[PDB]
Amino acid sequence: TKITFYNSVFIETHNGNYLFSMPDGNVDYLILDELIDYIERLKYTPYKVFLILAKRIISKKIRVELPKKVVLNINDNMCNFASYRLMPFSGFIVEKDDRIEINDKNWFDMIWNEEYNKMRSQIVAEDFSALPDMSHDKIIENIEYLFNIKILSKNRIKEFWEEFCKGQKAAIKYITQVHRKNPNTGRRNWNPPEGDFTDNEIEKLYETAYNTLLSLIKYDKNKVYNILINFNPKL
Amino acid sequence: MIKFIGTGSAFLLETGNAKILIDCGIEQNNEIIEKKINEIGKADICILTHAHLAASGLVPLLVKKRKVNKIISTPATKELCRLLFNDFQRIQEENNDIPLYSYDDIESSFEIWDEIDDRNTIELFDTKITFYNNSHIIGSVSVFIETHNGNYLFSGDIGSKLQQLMDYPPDMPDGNVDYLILESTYSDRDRLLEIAKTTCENGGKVLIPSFAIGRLQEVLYTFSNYNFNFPVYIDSPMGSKVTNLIKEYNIYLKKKLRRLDLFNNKYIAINTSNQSKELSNSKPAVIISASGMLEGGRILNHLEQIKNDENSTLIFVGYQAQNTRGRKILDVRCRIEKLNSFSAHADQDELIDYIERLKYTPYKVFLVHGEKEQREILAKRIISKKIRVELPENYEILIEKKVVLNINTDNMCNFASYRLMPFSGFIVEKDDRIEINDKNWFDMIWNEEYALPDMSHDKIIENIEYLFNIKILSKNRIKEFWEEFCKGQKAAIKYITQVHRKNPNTGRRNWNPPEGDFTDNEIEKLYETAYNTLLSLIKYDKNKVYNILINFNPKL
Amino acid sequence: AKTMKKIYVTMKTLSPLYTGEVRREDKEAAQKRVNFPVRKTATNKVLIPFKGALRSALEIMLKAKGENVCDTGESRARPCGRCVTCSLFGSMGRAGRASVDFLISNDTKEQIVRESTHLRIERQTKSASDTFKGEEVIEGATFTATITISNPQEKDLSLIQSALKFIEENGIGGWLNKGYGRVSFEVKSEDVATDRFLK
RNA sequence: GUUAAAACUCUUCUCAUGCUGGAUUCGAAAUUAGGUGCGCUUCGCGUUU
RNA sequence: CAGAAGAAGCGCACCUAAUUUCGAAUCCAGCAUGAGAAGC
Lengths: 235, 556, 199
Ligand SMILES: [Zn+2]
Ligand SMILES: [Zn+2]
Hints:
Helix content of chain C: 10-25%
Number of strands of chain C: 8
Distance between the termini of chain A: 70 Å
Largest sheet of chain A: 4 strands, parallel
Oligomer: part of a larger assembly
Order of helices and strands of chain C: EHEHHEEHEEEHE
Chains A, B: a protein
Strand order of the largest sheet of chain A: 1-2-3-4
Structural class of chain A: alpha/beta
PDB class: antiviral protein
Radius of gyration of chain C: 19 Å
Bound molecules: zinc ion
Strand content of chain C: 25-35%
Shape of chain C: globular
Largest interface: A-B, 44 and 51 residues
Largest sheet of chain C: 6 strands, antiparallel
Entry title: Cryo-EM structure of CTR-bound type VII CRISPR-Cas complex at substrate-engaged state I
Structural class of chain C: alpha+beta
Order of helices and strands of chain A: EEHEHEEEEHHHHHH
Number of strands of chain A: 7
Organism of A, B: metagenome
Keywords: a protein complex, antiviral protein
Radius of gyration of chain A: 38 Å
């Protein structure tokens, strides 16, 4: 930082030859009638003068300025009205960890829909609030067979237990959703059985999974947990 | 930051999110041109000031090497460059030197070519490019690249007061130009028609060499106002093509000349080569033909009939470059004369007056082209105006436009894991600073402060409704009117003028004909109703045009 | 180990090409303007999935030879982990030795992607019943990818080359039976050291 | 009005180190830029032996 | 201060640019080390 003193501190960096208040070198920022000649004496007229006087020196073809996170506008049709170029804009300033965005109503509408979908899809009817019949051994036999072949998996048994904690009705909803044969694809959400088979047999094992899980929802929680804990040791 | 590549000349302005290019062109080695073209890199935009080969010649080479995504220019510069690039490829192939690009590169260059008028602010890649007329040729504009780290005015070739087709005072960014890129320069108007008077009264033919772009039209506009009794004739496919370009793009010329025909008939264009052979055998006429520097062209079949005839003259109405036959016989059994008054470039004074009419004095004026000798005396005179100047034989402040909140962000909540505040304010764009400002701002500024035809909004909707159900106005017509209106307002005037123009030979417009049992007179009143209705919609603002036109064409 | 195969794959597009946009925001932005958007990067380059095409190619050819390969095209089909396709491109036990990159264009979307009008004509009145717009990749556009095979084996470049020929015949991307996606592949293979970056 | 009363088990010292949500699965299947419009209008192979 | 090479006219319009399926499944969730030292 080359500094020189005049009858005036002429610091000469690479970001501009600043001078707080006439050297013969190029002067970039002048940190400033008698006043006008001082600027006229400087060769290579300064880019900005940091100061009634401003009106005149603007008309002397010179820029003025009269005395944190980066702010990014996202909102752009303006108008001349009341001299300065301008637009009406109502919006939202958001304060990010390294920036300040200036968003509009469409952003808030987007995040309103994104939050409302989260809100509305958290409670599903009688949470924590005509089933077929099966003997306990038959439930053990069918869950064991459909656990060896990969239909009732540990993720399926886990997600059965989580919904059955939330009541019988949510468990029937989950089992009906997994067994549902989509009319456009002809496919159920069961994981397909491993081992060579035939589509009638595969459909009957899917039906067996539907009836064995549905006959387990009528049982007591502790009895359901003690049936499934022999297969998925977590839950 | 700006890099001055220039063989080829170009101005790459790396903003930091794009590579915007100004005036890729070559006036005159193909391999060093290709290496210098490879030196630029992938550019997002290639802005053309004017349609001269000194600033547009390398544009198809850039789409050969796939280094440009969009070629924006003026709508008359584009049409000019169609003829310009096919003529350059005709000459290059014809010379038997290996073509630098191909006609397919011309076509594909016009495939990615967008076009905007003057005073139309585009916003591509966090920048604001706006064109302003500078009166060099038709469609010649200075370019305002308003970035965040500086606002740059590329002047281009500034025009002169000698020009008569384009409005003289060169339009300049109304705001603040940080860095300015000027091109340093390289009353005999009455004398032309006068010496044509004496020559053709003496019984000779004035054979004026004229450049096909700008020059020939200036010469013809001279003769087409000074009532030269003897007939005036242009002889050049390209010269007459640009004559029809000037008549078609009449709305892009001077405001007085925007009420047209512009050339006052007078010229009887010689179309075929055989007619030019006939006129060369024919014995008092004004041959405003076009080979440029007495090179190959429709001049040379007429050159011999003047070359031996001392009674005729050969009026050199242009600069005559070295290694050309024209400079050789400029510097001969005929009268030779020179009139530099017909010049399309400025002189040093007009460059200074173009630089003293900005709102705020530019920080650095980069001189780029011109003679290296004359660039020095221009530099000395503008340093005498206390203005920093960086010559191109040489190689610094960091201007940064910022956005000020000016609203108190205390009372602020988190709703959807975002720390937000609904705020009502009045954002302002000040020179160098965008300032969001509360109603307190409007208050203070409130107490401080306080052509196209005309139809009511309902009249416009009712007329477009009737013409849509009479099938004069269609969804395609509304689509292309919106397309030309998104290029500016003069492009839309030229569109509706072209569609509404009754052809003098066939009496046929380009309007879609009506549906019903209408008669001829009523059909013409509906055509004029369509013309005045769309011209009344040109006056309205773009956001007022859109909701009017969306109830007829939902996709434009 | 101790070497890694690198297959530098260069696509030139012979017929037009369509691979649709997968990103919901980019697709929903572009379905306002064009009914079939093309897959595009955020740096405005064209993105083609390449691992699944090479897998699917080798599964069809090795099932047609009679060599044992599993099917990973059937719905929720567990990979076997024993076949050569499971060694090259992966199973549920071991990851894929071949790390196929995305086919990324050497040029920008405003240079090789065009918007096109497609129709449905009524077979009897020979008149347009449907009109859609789709984005296609122009012919001659160049795409590049690196198939980076860790733990190299002898038949792992040739099968890839074999699969490339299948992708040359059948096509890559979408609309493969309407003629879209016929391409040419040029190959440059190198056995890079696994410790090449250690300076 | 208690072999009482009076006197803080106090100070110093991080549950730390080692371990990548990884593996498997192609936005593609269905849809012809099609439909409407005539290179036409004007000019005798003259004249001359 | 940049390119240039038997007549005539015309070389324009209009529509459509949508629809539909799928958006699941599966494995894993362990182990090891240290339990003391020092002042008042
Ligand atoms: Zn020029
Ligand atoms: Zn396998």
